[PDB]
Design a binder for this molecule. Structure first.
Ligand SMILES: CC[C@@H](CN)c1ccccc1
Lengths: 237, 300
């Protein structure tokens, strides 16, 4: 069934699972035409497919050419997502295939279930968690590879960098969702927090800065302050 | 005009024949039903006064044999049987016609309801859905489960309707996932019509039989089957014009006949709203839409 706060440690057990977020697959800019009508222009997108235990991120870049000449793109995007996740699973050795796939949006259930009929033993599940994976395009290195793609492309990342050398998966996921939630709530402020100190840099092979354990505690506090601040600004509290 | 004699009526029971019904009191001198129209299947069904649990009954065609009902005090039900001795059966049916101990099938001449509900229903196909080859008639009751229900338990007592499952490899061609799920024409026309049923008459016959078992016995798996077969057509963008027109007639008479008071339990809100208002065929079922909107505007 559905994933929520009651069964949260399930994410970090030894059953391979993947989150799939489709919120950045079909992306557009809306603009006025010369005649004063409105039109959309697609930009490159991405499927966010994440193993929450290991940090492995399968970023399938969705190039705007896939929409050419297609209708009902928001519907098609869910089916294209499901097609690409099914292809990913089929590409993996049997012992690496997930036992469960958790979709962040319930509209993905039927598309994905239909594409995964060949895998009756892979459970397709919704979640009641509101996860901030739409903010993945606020991670500079992810946004860059997506926008620079000239063709469909799969890129593999570890979204935890090397954190698992020092902290558990549960703690790594909590840090990741805190960072992404902050970036979703106020991207400018969040990125300022992450970079305000030039002596801490992002390794070439990393996505986030090389904070010490003590610096992470400070950073994490500043992100909670940011989220509380914006919550007050928003609701006037 | 054929007859189904009854040896007696030892327990109080409501007896149905097709869409008609009448009450028989315990040990009342009742000896059966005469003037049954030749040319149609028929269903004779029972609800005991002392336990409305288990409605049960028998589908039969009087062209295939001479049938009678006899109460079995051990198994506690009215059983259909076949008399092989034609002389003896005709002799017995005459005695009773003479003593006027039979009710008459009460068909108004104007009235095509039963034909309209059984147009495509054939006894030979009933006997493949309800497997008991030693009898020419078929027993159904409220509790019997379908083969598809058993997959999700005694197979001898199951309803072997054709399994329809929209999220199945049978329904979905590899590489046409979105197309086949959103437009079920290939599942309807190639898999089901050409492949399994062979023609639309057999498809409609199973649809009509499923409805009638839903209505007369409150058989839940039958109701599921009826709606699935409707939904498969309504969810197909390419359906022969003659099938859509016939489906509209079939459903019209089903909705017309359905007891107003049973609509809450025999009609699936999701399927009907989808079929009449969202589906490819939302504008192709004019008669059905009109009767539904005038009889059951709540459900919609
Ligand atoms: C003609 C078959 C006998 C029972 N074998 C019977 C007796 C009375 C009424 C109906 C049928």
């Amino acid at each position: 069934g559905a994933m929520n706060s009651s069964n949260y440690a399930e994410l970090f057990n030894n059953d391979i699972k993947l989150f799939v977020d489709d919120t950045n697959v079909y992306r557009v800019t809306v603009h006025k035409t010369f005649e004063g009508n409105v039109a959309t222009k697609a930009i490159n997108g991405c499927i966010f497919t994440l193993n929450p235990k290991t940090g492995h991120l399968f970023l399938k870049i969705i190039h705007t050419s896939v929409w050419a000449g297609q209708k009902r793109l928001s519907q098609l995007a869910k089916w294209k997502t499901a097609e690409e996740v099914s292809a990913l699973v089929r590409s993996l050795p049997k012992e690496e295939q997930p036992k469960q796939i958790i979709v962040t949006r319930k509209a993905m259930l039927d598309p994905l279930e239909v594409h995964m009929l060949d895998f009756p033993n892979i459970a397709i599940r919704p979640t009641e968690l509101r996860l901030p994976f739409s903010a993945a395009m606020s991670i500079d290195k992810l946004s860059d590879v997506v926008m620079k793609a000239t063709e469909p492309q799969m890129v593999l990342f570890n979204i935890y960098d090397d954190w698992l050398d020092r902290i558990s998966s549960y703690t790594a996921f909590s840090r990741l969702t805190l960072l992404l939630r902050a970036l979703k709530t106020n991207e400018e402020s969040a990125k300022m927090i992450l970079l305000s100190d030039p002596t801490i840099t992002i390794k070439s092979y990393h996505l986030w800065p090389s904070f010490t354990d003590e610096q992470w505690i400070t950073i994490e506090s500043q992100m909670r302050d940011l989220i509380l601040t914006e919550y007050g600004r928003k609701y006037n509290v | 005009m054929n007859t189904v004699p009854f040896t007696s009526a030892p327990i109080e029971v409501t007896i149905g024949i097709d869409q008609y019904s009448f009450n028989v009191k315990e040990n009342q001198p009742f000896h059966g039903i005469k003037d049954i129209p030749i040319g149609h299947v028929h269903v004779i069904h029972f609800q005991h006064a002392d336990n409305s649990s288990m409605r049960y009954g028998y589908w039969f065609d009087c062209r295939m044999g001479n049938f009678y009902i006899q109460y079995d005090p051990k198994d506690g039900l009215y059983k259909m049987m076949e008399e092989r001795d034609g002389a003896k059966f005709e002799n017995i049916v005459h005695n009773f016609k003479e003593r006027q101990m039979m009710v008459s099938y009460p068909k108004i001449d104007e009235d095509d309801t039963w034909y309209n509900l059984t147009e495509f229903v054939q006894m030979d196909k009933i006997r493949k859905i309800v497997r008991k080859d030693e009898n020419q008639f078929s027993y159904v009751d409220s509790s019997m489960t379908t083969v598809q229900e058993n997959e999700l338990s005694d197979p001898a007592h199951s309803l072997n309707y054709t399994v329809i499952n929209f999220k199945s490899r049978e329904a979905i061609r590899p590489g046409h996932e979105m197309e086949d799920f959103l437009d079920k024409s290939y599942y309807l026309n190639t898999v089901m019509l050409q492949g399994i049923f062979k023609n639309s008459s057999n498809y409609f016959g199973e649809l009509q039989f499923a409805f009638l078992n839903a209505m007369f016995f409150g058989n839940y798996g039958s109701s599921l089957q009826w709606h699935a077969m409707i939904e498969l057509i309504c969810s197909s963008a390419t359906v022969p014009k003659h099938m859509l027109d016939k489906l509209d007639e079939i459903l019209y008479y089903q909705i017309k006949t359905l007891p107003e008071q049973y609509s809450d339990i025999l009609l699936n809100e999701r399927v009907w709203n989808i079929c009449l208002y969202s589906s490819f065929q939302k504008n192709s079922l004019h008669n059905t839409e009109k009767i539904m909107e005038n009889k059951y505007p709540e459900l919609l």
